Design an enzyme around this catalytic site. Sequence first.
Site, PDB file in Angstrom:
ATOM      1  N   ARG A   1      -2.384   1.870  -6.626  1.00  0.00           N
ATOM      2  CA  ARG A   1      -1.775   0.759  -7.336  1.00  0.00           C
ATOM      3  C   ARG A   1      -2.509   0.513  -8.652  1.00  0.00           C
ATOM      4  O   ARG A   1      -1.877   0.284  -9.686  1.00  0.00           O
ATOM      5  CB  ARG A   1      -1.775  -0.472  -6.441  1.00  0.00           C
ATOM      6  N   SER A   2      -3.837   0.605  -8.620  1.00  0.00           N
ATOM      7  CA  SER A   2      -4.641   0.420  -9.824  1.00  0.00           C
ATOM      8  C   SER A   2      -4.234   1.437 -10.891  1.00  0.00           C
ATOM      9  O   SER A   2      -4.071   1.087 -12.059  1.00  0.00           O
ATOM     10  CB  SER A   2      -6.132   0.569  -9.497  1.00  0.00           C
TER      11      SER A   2
ATOM     12  N   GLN B   1      -1.014   7.581  -6.321  1.00  0.00           N
ATOM     13  CA  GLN B   1      -1.029   8.165  -4.983  1.00  0.00           C
ATOM     14  C   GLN B   1       0.265   8.675  -4.351  1.00  0.00           C
ATOM     15  O   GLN B   1       0.219   9.290  -3.294  1.00  0.00           O
ATOM     16  CB  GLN B   1      -1.689   7.173  -4.037  1.00  0.00           C
TER      17      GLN B   1
ATOM     18  N   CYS C   1      -7.255  -2.267  -6.177  1.00  0.00           N
ATOM     19  CA  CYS C   1      -6.349  -2.394  -5.046  1.00  0.00           C
ATOM     20  C   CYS C   1      -7.316  -2.209  -3.867  1.00  0.00           C
ATOM     21  O   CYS C   1      -8.382  -2.810  -3.875  1.00  0.00           O
ATOM     22  CB  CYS C   1      -5.241  -1.318  -5.077  1.00  0.00           C
TER      23      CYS C   1
ATOM     24  N   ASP D   1       0.836  -1.182   0.000  1.00  0.00           N
ATOM     25  CA  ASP D   1       0.000   0.000   0.000  1.00  0.00           C
ATOM     26  C   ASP D   1       0.879   1.242   0.000  1.00  0.00           C
ATOM     27  O   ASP D   1       1.860   1.311   0.739  1.00  0.00           O
ATOM     28  CB  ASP D   1      -0.892  -0.025   1.233  1.00  0.00           C
TER      29      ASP D   1
HETATM   30  O1  LIG Z   1      -0.987   2.991  -3.208  1.00  0.00           O
HETATM   31  C1  LIG Z   1      -2.168   2.858  -2.905  1.00  0.00           C
HETATM   32  C2  LIG Z   1      -2.821   3.580  -1.777  1.00  0.00           C
HETATM   33  C3  LIG Z   1      -4.109   2.889  -1.404  1.00  0.00           C
HETATM   34  C4  LIG Z   1      -5.152   3.824  -0.823  1.00  0.00           C
HETATM   35  C5  LIG Z   1      -5.281   5.197  -1.338  1.00  0.00           C
HETATM   36  C6  LIG Z   1      -6.269   6.107  -0.753  1.00  0.00           C
HETATM   37  C7  LIG Z   1      -7.130   5.644   0.342  1.00  0.00           C
HETATM   38  C8  LIG Z   1      -8.150   6.566   0.932  1.00  0.00           C
HETATM   39  C9  LIG Z   1      -7.976   6.764   2.433  1.00  0.00           C
HETATM   40  N1  LIG Z   1      -9.197   7.404   2.917  1.00  0.00           N
HETATM   41  S1  LIG Z   1      -9.537   7.456   4.582  1.00  0.00           S
HETATM   42  O2  LIG Z   1     -11.272   7.535   4.435  1.00  0.00           O
HETATM   43  O3  LIG Z   1      -9.036   6.015   5.378  1.00  0.00           O
HETATM   44  C10 LIG Z   1      -8.925   9.015   5.190  1.00  0.00           C
HETATM   45  C11 LIG Z   1      -7.617   9.207   5.821  1.00  0.00           C
HETATM   46  C12 LIG Z   1      -7.105  10.561   6.041  1.00  0.00           C
HETATM   47  C13 LIG Z   1      -7.902  11.721   5.634  1.00  0.00           C
HETATM   48  C14 LIG Z   1      -9.216  11.523   5.004  1.00  0.00           C
HETATM   49  C15 LIG Z   1     -10.018  12.684   4.600  1.00  0.00           C
HETATM   50  F1  LIG Z   1     -11.353  12.407   3.986  1.00  0.00           F
HETATM   51  F2  LIG Z   1      -9.288  13.517   3.588  1.00  0.00           F
HETATM   52  F3  LIG Z   1     -10.403  13.536   5.787  1.00  0.00           F
HETATM   53  C16 LIG Z   1      -9.726  10.170   4.782  1.00  0.00           C
HETATM   54  C17 LIG Z   1      -6.756   7.650   2.719  1.00  0.00           C
HETATM   55  N2  LIG Z   1      -5.527   7.215   3.252  1.00  0.00           N
HETATM   56  C18 LIG Z   1      -4.686   8.345   3.362  1.00  0.00           C
HETATM   57  C19 LIG Z   1      -3.311   8.318   3.873  1.00  0.00           C
HETATM   58  C20 LIG Z   1      -2.767   7.034   4.365  1.00  0.00           C
HETATM   59  C21 LIG Z   1      -1.389   6.967   4.889  1.00  0.00           C
HETATM   60  C22 LIG Z   1      -0.550   8.185   4.919  1.00  0.00           C
HETATM   61  C23 LIG Z   1      -1.093   9.466   4.429  1.00  0.00           C
HETATM   62  C24 LIG Z   1      -2.471   9.535   3.907  1.00  0.00           C
HETATM   63  C25 LIG Z   1      -5.446   9.484   2.878  1.00  0.00           C
HETATM   64  N3  LIG Z   1      -6.727   9.043   2.477  1.00  0.00           N
HETATM   65  C26 LIG Z   1      -7.003   4.268   0.856  1.00  0.00           C
HETATM   66  C27 LIG Z   1      -6.018   3.365   0.273  1.00  0.00           C
HETATM   67  S2  LIG Z   1      -4.678   2.092  -2.915  1.00  0.00           S
HETATM   68  O4  LIG Z   1      -5.236   0.567  -2.534  1.00  0.00           O
HETATM   69  O5  LIG Z   1      -5.793   3.017  -3.817  1.00  0.00           O
HETATM   70  N4  LIG Z   1      -2.979   2.052  -3.603  1.00  0.00           N
END
Ligand SMILES: O=C1C[C@@H](c2ccc(C[C@H](NS(=O)(=O)c3cccc(C(F)(F)F)c3)c3nc(-c4ccccc4)c[nH]3)cc2)S(=O)(=O)N1
Length: 296
Positions: A219-220, A260, A213, A179
């Site tokens: 990753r997708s 990402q 992903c 990830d």
């Molecule tokens: O390489 C990758 C990353 C994964 C991925 C990408 C985005 C998310 C959405 C995730 N969404 S939440 O709903 O779990 C989440 C987390 C933080 C802020 C937030 C606001 F809506 F912006 F408030 C939502 C999210 N994670 C973060 C990170 C994680 C680690 C470090 C920095 C930032 C920010 N958004 C989940 C998995 S993937 O399977 O698409 N491939």
Amino acid sequence: MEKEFEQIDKSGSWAAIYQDIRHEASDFPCRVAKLPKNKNRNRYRDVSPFDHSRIKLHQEDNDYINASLIKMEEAQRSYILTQGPLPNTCGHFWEMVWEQKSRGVVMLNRVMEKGSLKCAQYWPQKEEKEMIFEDTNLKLTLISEDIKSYYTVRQLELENLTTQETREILHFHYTTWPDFGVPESPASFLNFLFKVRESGSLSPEHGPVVVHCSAGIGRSGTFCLADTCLLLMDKRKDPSSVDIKKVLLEMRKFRMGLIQTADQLRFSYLAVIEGAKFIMGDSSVQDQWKELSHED
Ligand SMILES: O=C1C[C@@H](c2ccc(C[C@H](NS(=O)(=O)c3cccc(C(F)(F)F)c3)c3nc(-c4ccccc4)c[nH]3)cc2)S(=O)(=O)N1
């Protein structure tokens, strides 16, 4: 391409390029994704499909599924990027695979990564234990699988219970891509991509291959961006016209957040640059990739 790659390294501007891309990315609405009744159909509150490119289920009740049709017109290929199915949306996932006539599904995450659920077990782990999706009247059975060191290919049989019809679905599951991270090397990535290409799942005779992903954008997006860039290098009468950043921005017109991390974009370059050798005519790179990926 490697000239520009080369110059970004020294400049240390990989992050700057990536942040500009984020700033210049399209910003369309997701009104249907944010509806209250569809809240439990979205694994992540901040990753939704645009209303204009989302995939619509053919059920007369709720046609929502967090998935987008990425139609690269000049490259002549379409991809369906979706999130890792949820316990309640696995029927939805197969309904979409069936209605859209997909032939293959590309999984790039694992159900559990670093002690966290990132996707539901939406396919049968054992032959003797098929799965039945009663909300969509579908059956799914594992017929065989081919387990490599860092990825597994599975033959599945989805059957429309109502009509009694069945279809063979090839599942390409990359099991070693972390990830917010990258494949172990261009070699492994390319070997895997060409495995999917060689199978027919990306043929124009089939519906859009389904890629995912956990959130369906990182990753997708890396997978899809590299595949399209190589498709274009092979089409255009000159692989130097291909601008990855321009291609990425085009893809983000269909789905938000594709790619990402700044490092994922840099792997993209590395993958395309390496992949280019094959497109040019080098009839030895593919096998080297396989022998370099230690798939056994
Ligand atoms: O390489 C990758 C990353 C994964 C991925 C990408 C985005 C998310 C959405 C995730 N969404 S939440 O709903 O779990 C989440 C987390 C933080 C802020 C937030 C606001 F809506 F912006 F408030 C939502 C999210 N994670 C973060 C990170 C994680 C680690 C470090 C920095 C930032 C920010 N958004 C989940 C998995 S993937 O399977 O698409 N491939």
